[PDB]
Design a protein around this nucleic acid. Structure first.
Length: 1121
RNA sequence: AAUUUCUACUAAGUGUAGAUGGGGU
């Protein structure tokens, strides 16, 4: 078995969360001794103390830099963009810059206690000394011994600034994007001195700190000399950003001065942009990061009401793009446009089709470099190398009088028009006394209003983002860039406010906020060492079927160890974990004495509880529940062991029993699964909505660690390759999405014969023998019908995403069993390549999550029902996958998950192999005549009313991919022309096309007459009917059941493949539908790969490209069948 | 419409079928 090999490979750890319920008098005892209000108090002061800690971190940035500020290595970064050195703009920049990130590191790094500021010591001594306010000092010392709480904050705020740039460091907005706004400062002032006079420059030169007596380092050109990270970033922005004197004197910086020339006398006045500084407080992450949003009226939206910054800059960007026309006179080339995902949309918006830009550039590439297979990839990579497409360069890839610039201007202006349209519909929410009616999460009208405006602005942001380029260019129009970039900086503010309100409304009715329970002990539950039972003061107890958590406290931290054996009692077995957090002994302790302690105030026993610990629990337990019981089982011999550090938190009541939705006792309870025969239930009791969140839970997040001692450690990919070579029959699960099925699975064997083809739209949940199915596809449809109304409210999309994530969890199970029963490599798609968009099913994001959860599941692949110690069982999960690295590491193979490009796997005939490799779109009469002419022989075969189109695929364009190169295209059978559909019979329509135009089809080879036709519209319909002939997947938009494939070519037995012939059959041998074909050939593209492993050498099975190009495909697809 | 938590549920009557690494910014 191929799967069996992969066990005990790596070692992941996990955290089985659970709940604990205060058994005995624990709750009252905790309350008597106020054992948890200090944990609560600290957790309400976390933020407060974080701010104080950050003040010391900001003084570190200040003082250290203030003194050590000479830009060490590169003089004062004088050679920054001076004259090109060895290698133009290559080493010239790169090296100078990287010595730059160390110029800053050295300053900090080894100072007066880097580790005295970034470890426990700060809040204990250094921070109290830094402060002086009694309240603040006491707050900081109340958060002492308790720095194991600020650990994450420490690391974040320390490792973000080192000898690197980018990321979120000082160098970034310290030497990288800081010097872009700097640089023109201490040399050839020149251009910027248009004004800069006695009433201007001299006035401000006396106002600023007289260390910089004159302006010197302020405007000019070439190199710079001041600020760095800290000297007062505001010092540079005193004239560059403007610093109005408190007295009243209007000091207008130095750039805030140009505006008297930059815009008043009109120009671009050499940039001079406001210096960037440390993100948020100290180089954090987002500068707009804020909290709040806890109540329905917590802030009436910072957007025009409580966020006027945003509203201001939509107008600013709008004016800047309305100045695009005079920026043509300035520097149209200077404005760039990032090549990427936006470039296709840009093409459509400006020119008309999504591929104008691409193809125009590809044509120019052909002029200078030449299509074939490898030439496609040459063009591809080189287009990916381009990162900006100047505006005038895009005008060259134009059409006619189409002005790329002006078309962009118009489209992007109408984008803000959309914003303002919804700003007029949100006036109610923006009015001072907004009458809040039914909450906010229940006020779907308000949700919609919010969403609409928030997303209108968000869309403009993403559209105008591109008008940036790659930043690192040359002739950047400085009348555009600079002014535009300032406004855009703010229009990035919306992102946060959108997220805030979205996440408020999409919020659950309850809350899962917890506070770490230290119980007056910073070292609480941090281990399970037998020898140290009084250090962390915690042990897992066991009352036979129940599981507990004993936690002794301060003045009685060793009580249990004295009074153990209760002999003839129930004995809450103390854990005798003699191994390190498998020696899972369980010392039978006390019962009467354990409970005695709980009632007194000594112990604080809690109960570990999952729904599968009830006596009323009827069926299969959860996997985590299983793992938990298995930690303390005899079977676990070192698989799932303890990791140490149970984080007991405390989730309070977010809801109250009285305001929950009840299903009164003895009243028939309607069942909501359409496929439930036993509709209605009538329960003897009541059932409330979310009763666990209406009470107080004590979340015990027990860390556990799977396979910490791996025996069979090997590289997974190479071992998969070896296994997929020595096998006689490599089955491939083959998973494609699809429109009719959500995740159609076509298991295909080692010869390409369909073994199974079932849509996983229905999950047949098997409980007590009875298999009640759930049409997740129909559920999706009903959820999408809810989405249809109220403009896809935020919650409806969340519900779809969550149902799709719960579906994903369900397909993960099914695929796991499919893989297990067939020993089959999945054949998922490399999602970093091309794009399936037709699928009205699992999307890219959800399939990426699917394959992440397949490689997270495939790390410890476990089916619940299987016996724990058998393969596939709880402690023998298959490690057939890798370990999720990134979403871009999902590109080749991650074990039993070959990511194959999904190119032409669905629109290919599964019987012959024919792929339409020919563009059959009527361009001009001549194009189709050459098309018609390149056919070997077009005859009407009246025998079987057909129109044979013998063709040479070696005599065509972009067709090097093919293999047979000689196909006869008989117009036969029925096509569904989706224009919204018509079922056009091919032969009949062609007979009638030829009858109408006078083309006597009854003339043997009539190709000459077809090319003879002088009517333009003849070929139009001719080429469109030819397109239909070649179209294989044919399905009526909507009606599920007409999913058929139809070949224009006959096979070796003369039959034209029909999917509808096979859809009637249960054991079909060829795809029974369109999406089945897809999964069939995705399991066949992986099949080319498997053949490649038996065609490549064993020791060489590692670099065998599994990347199947379309030329080794369309060969095999046209030759094995 | 019950849940360690999530999704679908009622699924044989206080539950069921799957999945579930979480902890700090």
């Amino acid at each position: 078995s191929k799967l069996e090999k992969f066990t005990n490979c790596y070692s992941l750890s996990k955290t089985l969360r659970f709940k604990a319920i205060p058994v005995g008098k624990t709750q009252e005892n905790i309350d008597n001794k106020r054992l948890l209000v200090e944990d609560e108090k600290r957790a309400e002061d976390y933020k407060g103390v974080k701010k104080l800690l950050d003040r010391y971190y900001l003084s570190f940035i200040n003082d250290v830099l203030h003194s050590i500020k000479l830009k060490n290595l590169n003089n004062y970064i004088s050679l920054f963009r001076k004259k090109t050195r060895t290698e133009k703009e290559n080493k010239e920049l790169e090296n100078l810059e990287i010595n730059l990130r160390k110029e800053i590191a050295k300053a900090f790094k080894g100072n007066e206690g880097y580790k005295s500021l970034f470890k426990k010591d700060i809040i204990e001594t250094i921070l109290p000394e830094f402060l002086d306010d009694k309240d603040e000092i006491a707050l900081v010392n109340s958060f002492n011994g308790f720095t194991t709480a600020f650990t994450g904050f420490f690391d974040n705020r320390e490792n973000m600034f080192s000898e690197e740039a980018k990321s979120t460091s000082i160098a970034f907005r310290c030497i990288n994007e800081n010097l872009t706004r700097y640089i023109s400062n201490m040399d050839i002032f020149e251009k910027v001195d248009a004004i800069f006079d006695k009433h201007e420059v001299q006035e401000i030169k006396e106002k600023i700190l007289n260390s910089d007596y004159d302006v010197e380092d302020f405007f000019e050109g070439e190199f710079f000399n001041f600020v760095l990270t800290q000297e007062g970033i505001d010092v540079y922005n005193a004239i560059i950003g403007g610093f109005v004197t408190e007295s009243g004197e209007k000091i207008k910086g130095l750039n805030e001065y140009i505006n008297l020339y930059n815009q008043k006398t009109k120009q671009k006045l050499p940039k001079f942009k406001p210096l960037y500084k440390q993100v948020l407080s100290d180089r954090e992450s987002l500068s707009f990061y804020g909290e709040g949003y806890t109540s329905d009226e917590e802030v009436l939206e910072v957007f025009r009401n409580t966020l006027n910054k945003n509203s201001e800059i939509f107008s600013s960007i709008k004016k800047l793009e309305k100045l695009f026309k005079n920026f043509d006179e300035y520097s149209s080339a200077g404005i760039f446009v990032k090549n990427g995902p936006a470039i296709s949309t840009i093409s459509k918006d400006i020119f008309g089709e999504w591929n104008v830009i691409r193809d125009k550039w590809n044509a120019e590439y052909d002029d200078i470099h030449l299509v074939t297979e490898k030439y496609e990839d040459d063009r591809r990579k080189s287009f990916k190398k381009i990162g900006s497409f100047s505006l005038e360069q895009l005008q060259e890839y134009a059409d006619a009088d189409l002005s790329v610039v002006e078309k962009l201007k118009e489209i992007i202006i109408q984008k803000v028009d959309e914003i303002y349209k919804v700003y007029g519909s949100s006036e109610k929410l923006f009015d001072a006394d907004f009458v809040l009616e039914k909450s906010l999460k229940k006020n779907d009208a308000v949700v919609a209003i919010m969403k609409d405006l928030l997303d209108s602005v968000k869309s403009f942001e993403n559209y105008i983002k591109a008008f940036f380029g790659e930043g690192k260019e040359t002739n950047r129009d400085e009348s555009f860039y600079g002014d535009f970039v300032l406004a855009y900086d703010i229009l990035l503010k919306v992102d946060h406010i959108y997220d805030a309100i979205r996440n408020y409304v999409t919020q659950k009715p309850y809350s899962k906020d917890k506070f770490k329970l230290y119980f007056q002990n910073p070292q609480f539950m941090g281990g399970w060492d037998k020898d140290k039972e009084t250090d962390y003061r915690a042990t897992i107890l066991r009352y036979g079927s129940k599981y507990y958590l004993a936690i002794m406290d301060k003045k009685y931290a060793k009580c249990l160890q004295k009074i153990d054996k209760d002999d003839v009692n129930g004995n809450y077995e103390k854990i005798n974990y003699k191994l390190l957090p498998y020696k899972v002994s369980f010392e039978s302790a006390s019962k009467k004495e354990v409970d005695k302690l709980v009632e007194e105030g000594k112990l604080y026993m809690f109960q570990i509880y999952n729904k599968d610990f009830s006596d009323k629990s009827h069926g299969t337990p959860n996997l985590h529940t299983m793992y938990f019981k298995l930690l303390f089982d005899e079977n676990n011999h070192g698989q799932i062991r303890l990791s140490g550090g149970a984080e007991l938190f405390m989730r309070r009541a977010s809801l109250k029993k009285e305001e929950l939705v009840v299903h009164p006792a003895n009243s028939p309870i309607a069942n909501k699964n359409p496929d439930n025969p036993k509709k209605t239930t009538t329960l003897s009791y009541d059932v409330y909505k979310d009763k666990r969140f209406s009470e107080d839970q004590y979340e015990l997040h027990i860390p556990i660690a799977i396979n910490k001692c791996p025996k069979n450690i090997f590289k997974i990919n190479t071992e998969v390759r070896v296994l997929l070579k020595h096998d006689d029959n490599p089955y491939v699960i083959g998973i494609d999405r699809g429109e009719r099925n959500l995740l159609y699975i076509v298991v295909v064997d080692g010869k390409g014969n369909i073994v199974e083809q079932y849509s996983l739209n229905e999950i047949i949940n098997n409980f007590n023998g009875i298999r009640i199915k759930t049409d997740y596809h129909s559920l999706l449809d009903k959820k999408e019908k809810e989405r249809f109304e109220a403009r896809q409210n935020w919650t409806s999309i969340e519900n779809i995403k969550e149902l799709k994530a719960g579906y994903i969890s369900q397909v993960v199970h099914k695929i796991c069993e499919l893989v297990e029963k067939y020993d089959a490599v999945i054949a998922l798609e490399d999602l970093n390549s091309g794009f399936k968009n037709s699928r009205v099913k699992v999307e890219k994001q959800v399939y990426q999550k699917f394959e992440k959860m397949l490689i997270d599941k495939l790390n410890y692949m476990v089916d619940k029902k299987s016996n724990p110690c058998a393969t596939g069982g709880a402690l023998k999960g298959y490690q057939i996958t890798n370990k999720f690295e990134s979403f871009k590491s999902m590109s080749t193979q991650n074990g039993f998950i070959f990511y194959i490009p999904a190119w032409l796997t669905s629109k290919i005939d599964p019987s012959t192999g024919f792929v339409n490799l020919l563009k059959t779109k009527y361009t001009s009469i001549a194009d189709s005549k050459k098309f018609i002419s390149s056919f070997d022989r077009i005859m009407y075969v009246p025998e079987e009313d057909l129109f044979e189109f013998a063709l040479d695929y070696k005599n065509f364009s972009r067709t090097d991919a093919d293999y047979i190169k000689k196909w006869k295209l008989y117009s036969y059978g029925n096509r569904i022309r989706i224009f919204d559909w018509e079922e056009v019979c091919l032969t009949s329509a062609y007979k009638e096309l030829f009858n109408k135009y006078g083309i006597n089809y009854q003339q043997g080879d009539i190709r000459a007459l077809l090319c003879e036709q002088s009517d333009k519209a003849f070929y139009s319909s001719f080429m469109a009917l030819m397109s239909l002939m070649l179209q294989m997947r044919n399905s009526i938009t909507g009606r599920t059941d007409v999913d058929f494939l139809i070949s224009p070519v006959k096979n070796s037995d003369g039959i034209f493949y029909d999917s509808r012939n096979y859809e009637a059959q249960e054991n079909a041998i060829l795809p029974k539908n369109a999406d089945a074909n897809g999964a069939y050939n995705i399991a066949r593209k992986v099949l080319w790969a498997i053949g490649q492993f038996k065609k490549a050498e064993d020791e060489k099975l590692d670099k065998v490209k599994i990347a199947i190009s379309n030329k080794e495909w369309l060969e095999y697809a046209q030759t094995s069948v």
